[PDB]
Design a protein around this ligand. Structure first.
Ligand SMILES: O=C(O)CNC(=O)c1ncc(-c2cc(-c3cccc(Cl)c3)no2)cc1O
Ligand SMILES: [Zn+2]
Length: 341
């Protein structure tokens, strides 16, 4: 019952439907729509305050970036080195390189490669000509090495609105802005992040499927010390119900964001992102903020994301107390077998 994005929106000027369901991939779980609201709507304000997702339609957060395409960026983004991830499949499973030492019998299926922006544009054009099925994804934090016109657009962002959001929520500093340029059909598999995220869509359309933190049991993340920490072990395209039985109980929140839309992805919320099939390249800029500090007085019962934080810290402490992350598993099983299960 994954009819969660509602009926496709009609573009202004009678330009037809922005998308159709044939461009969405099919999955085994039901979803329900994420609310699409105006930033002036108080309902959207209490959704963000209570850490629930919402699509804001009229923030003008990245208004100067809506003119961006591959040509404009190649001319103005500068000559810095851009992280580009390759893959032979539509799923871009990212991995922590610093944690690759803990798991030697782990081979990554999507390698990173730095390059110039013109090399990335060229590498895309070869694949389209060659008819190849290799897929690329540019994920690069913007810094000071960008050209003059790009800094013009960056300064043109609606900092008034997003800084006021940072203050009202007690969030920490803006950690980074990640520029995402992906091919059609590209998929970022389900994972969660430990920061608050404003997902500002620029070019193309992306389907975003979100799961609240209380569905930890249904999504089976890798061990904290695994390179794929915070990512789900479940193959959404071929779910192993024997290893992951509670994935049969997972329920999602779904929406399709287009140019001008801003999706609030609350901290610790799972998200599965896919660029719509046959929808052209996609461009996104997201804004990451450190969450509000833990309050002095602890209120019980704990929120679901607090229990996830407790589980992460236990795995972390266990890994350094034993001197080897590989012993975390056997000791945890020893602790519960015949005692808590
Ligand atoms: O595709 C879309 O539109 C949506 N993209 C996302 O949601 C998204 N979010 C967060 C991250 C991320 C990856 C890491 C990281 C990876 C490997 C090693 C190390 Cl050290 C750090 N940190 O953050 C990547 C993402 O793709
Ligand atoms: Zn993420």
């Amino acid at each position: 019952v994954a009819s969660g994005s509602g009926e496709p929106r009609e573009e202004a000027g009678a330009l037809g439907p922005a998308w159709d369901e044939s461009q969405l991939r099919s999955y085994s779980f039901p979803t329900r729509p994420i609310p699409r609201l105006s930033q002036s709507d108080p309902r959207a304000e209490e959704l963000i305050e209570n850490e629930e997702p919402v699509v804001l339609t009229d923030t003008n957060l990245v208004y100067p970036a809506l003119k961006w395409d591959l040509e404009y960026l190649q001319e103005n983004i500068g000559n810095g080195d851009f992280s580009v991830y390759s893959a032979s499949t539509h799923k871009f499973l990212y991995y922590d390189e610093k944690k690759m030492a803990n798991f030697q019998n782990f081979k990554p299926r999507s390698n990173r490669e730095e390059m110039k922006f013109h090399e990335f544009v060229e590498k895309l054009q070869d694949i389209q000509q060659r008819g190849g099925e290799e897929r690329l994804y540019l994920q690069q934090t913007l810094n000071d090495t960008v050209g003059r016109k790009i800094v013009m657009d960056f300064l043109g962002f609606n900092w008034n609105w997003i800084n006021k959001q940072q203050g009202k929520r007690g969030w920490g500093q803006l950690t980074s802005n990640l520029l995402l340029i992906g091919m059609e059909g590209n998929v970022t598999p389900a994972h969660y992040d430990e920061q608050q995220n404003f997902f500002a869509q620029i070019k193309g359309y992306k389907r975003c499927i979100l799961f609240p933190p209380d569905q930890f049991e249904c999504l089976y993340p890798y061990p904290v010390h695994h390179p794929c920490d915070r990512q789900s072990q479940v193959d959404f395209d071929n779910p192993d119900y024997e290893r992951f039985p509670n994935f049969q109980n997972v329920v999602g929140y779904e929406t399709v964001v287009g140019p001008g839309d801003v999706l609030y992805i609350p901290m610790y919320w799972w998200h599965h992102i896919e660029s719509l099939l046959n929808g052209g390249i996609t461009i996104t800029v997201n804004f990451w903020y450190k969450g509000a500090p833990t309050p002095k007085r602890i209120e019980y019962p704990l929120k679901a994301h607090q229990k996830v934080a407790i589980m992460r810290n236990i795995e972390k402490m266990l890994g350094e107390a034993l001197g080897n992350p590989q012993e975390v598993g056997p000791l945890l099983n020893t602790m519960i077998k015949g005692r808590y299960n």
